[PDB]
């Protein structure tokens, strides 16, 4: 939780399963 919108993690912002993990980052 860092001051500003730049603390969110990738693993927690890109799903995990092959259903969404195969999307576009």
UniProtKB/Swiss-Prot annotation:
Per UniProt, what does mutating residue 24 to H do? In strain: Omicron/BA.1, Omicron/BA.2, Omicron/BA.2.12.1, Omicron/BA.2.75, Omicron/BA.4, Omicron/BA.5, Omicron/BQ.1.1, Omicron/XBB.1.5, Omicron/EG.5.1
Listed name of the protein: Spike protein S1
Q: How does it assemble?
A: Binds to host ACE2. RBD also interacts with the N-linked glycan on 'Asn-90' of ACE2. Cleavage of S generates a polybasic C-terminal sequence on S1 that binds to host Neuropilin-1 (NRP1) and Neuropilin-2 (NRP2) receptors. Interacts with host integrin alpha-5/beta-1 (ITGA5:ITGB1) and with ACE2 in complex with integrin alpha-5/beta-1 (ITGA5:ITGB1). May interact via cytoplasmic c-terminus with M protein. May interact (via N-terminus) with host bilirubin and biliverdin, thereby preventing antibody binding to the SARS-CoV-2 spike NTD via an allosteric mechanism.
Q: What is the effect of changing residue 9 to L?
A: Increased resistance to neutralizing antibodies and human covalescent sera neutralization
What mutagenesis or variant effect is reported for residue 17 to R? In strain: Omicron/BA.1, Omicron/BA.2, Omicron/BA.2.12.1, Omicron/BA.2.75, Omicron/BA.4, Omicron/BA.5, Omicron/BQ.1.1, Omicron/XBB.1.5, Omicron/EG.5.1
Biological role: Attaches the virion to the cell membrane by interacting with host receptor, initiating the infection. The major receptor is host ACE2. When S2/S2' has been cleaved, binding to the receptor triggers direct fusion at the cell membrane. When S2/S2' has not been cleaved, binding to the receptor results in internalization of the virus by endocytosis using host TFRC and GRM2 and leading to fusion of the virion membrane with the host endosomal membrane. Alternatively, may use NRP1/NRP2 and integrin as entry receptors.
Its domain of life? Viruses
Q: What is the effect of changing residue 15 to S?
A: In strain: Omicron/BA.1
High-level lineage: Viruses, Riboviria, Orthornavirae, Pisuviricota, Pisoniviricetes
